[PDB]
Design a protein around this ligand. Structure first.
Ligand SMILES: *C(=O)c1cc(C[C@H](NC(C)=O)C(=O)N[C@H]2CCCCN(Cc3ccc(-c4ccccc4)cc3)C2=O)ccc1C(=O)O
Length: 106
């Protein structure tokens, strides 16, 4: 269950997610999952990044959920669960700003 996952922050806004992620103590890959503000049924993965050009910054990725069952950021790479998707992205950066590392502090 998603609401049981420590990285699921539920109904929090984009600005709130950025407020939580823009903490200097957060290494790259700090993240959380929240409801999509615009697509019913979808979610968003907010991830902290850091580079010399931009400094500490946040990126937001839309996670689609199919009625057919698949969860994915890109339709080419789908998962049977949100947990599996998180697990996979904690190991592969792929198109993400950084692989997922630790859950964002509240
Ligand atoms: C969630 O809040 C959400 C997010 C988005 C997309 C987001 N836009 C905004 C307005 O927040 C956005 O544009 N994010 C970027 C992230 C940076 C990369 C560029 N792209 C395109 C993209 C996305 C993902 C990949 C990828 C990732 C992993 C594996 C393979 C490929 C490549 C390219 C972005 O999307 C929209 C809406 C919402 C919402 O809350 O509703």
């Amino acid at each position: 269950s998603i609401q049981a996952e420590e990285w699921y922050f539920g109904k929090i806004t984009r600005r709130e997610s950025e407020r939580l992620l823009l903490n200097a103590e957060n290494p790259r890959g700090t993240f959380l999952v929240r409801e999509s503000e615009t697509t019913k049924g979808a979610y968003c993965l907010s991830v902290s990044d850091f580079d010399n050009a931009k400094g500490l910054n946040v990126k937001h990725y839309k996670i689609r959920k199919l009625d057919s069952g698949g969860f994915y950021i890109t339709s080419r790479t789908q998962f049977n669960s949100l947990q599996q998707l998180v697990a996979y992205y904690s190991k592969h950066a792929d198109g993400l700003c950084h692989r997922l590392t630790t859950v964002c502090p509240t």
